[PDB]
Design a protein around this ligand. Sequence first.
Ligand SMILES: C[C@H]1CC[C@@H](O)[C@H]1NC(=O)[C@H](Cc1ccccc1)C[C@H](O)CN1CCN(C(=O)CCc2cccnc2)C[C@H]1C(=O)NC(C)(C)C
Lengths: 99, 99
Amino acid sequence: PQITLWQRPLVTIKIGGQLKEALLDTGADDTVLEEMSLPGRWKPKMIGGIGGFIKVRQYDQILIEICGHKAIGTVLVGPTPVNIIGRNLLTQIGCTLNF
Amino acid sequence: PQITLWQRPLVTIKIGGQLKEALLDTGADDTVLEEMSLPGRWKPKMIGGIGGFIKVRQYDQILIEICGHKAIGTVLVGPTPVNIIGRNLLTQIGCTLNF
Ligand SMILES: C[C@H]1CC[C@@H](O)[C@H]1NC(=O)[C@H](Cc1ccccc1)C[C@H](O)CN1CCN(C(=O)CCc2cccnc2)C[C@H]1C(=O)NC(C)(C)C
């Protein structure tokens, strides 16, 4: 797909059999999802955004289908404004910027 | 050009004679730059993100040169850790997300 940026790039993702809206964020290194229950253990992470740092929990090897494209990688759960898809998953689905 | 997301999408921009390094961010609605002097009148704005809100100065109708391409728009100047080129100017250079 080709997505223009006139509007906010919100796509539908499927995680844990659920559907959610997520932001295709190229300026985000990591994928950060809203507070939810993921399986397995979690390690601690401190990520910094525009207003400083927050603490998140990292889950490894989570299957997440972004627009009919499967991806298995690291997902961070924490107090984020919206669900964010970062470069770690954007590269898995073959996402690039063109101009 | 086609920019892959293995690395951070950084590019050189020219604003007011100064050449700066900026990150192409599809997750950002606005364009925010590190503290600097821009001519004209400004308006205090409060923008939020991961970590919270920061107070920025809003300058309208500012010209920026993103990889040779010129773009005219509103740029916020404040205490940001990275120079962000948001959707408002991304659309101007015909920036698109493909996968
Ligand atoms: C994702 C993190 C993981 C690790 C870092 O990679 C990190 N990246 C980022 O945070 C980068 C900046 C950065 C990159 C590299 C080094 C340091 C900092 C910004 C992010 O891509 C854009 N971001 C998405 C979430 N946002 C929203 O949903 C807004 C919703 C909303 C609701 C109500 C009121 N206001 C806003 C805020 C928005 C943002 O920042 N927008 C502005 C205008 C402020 C720039």
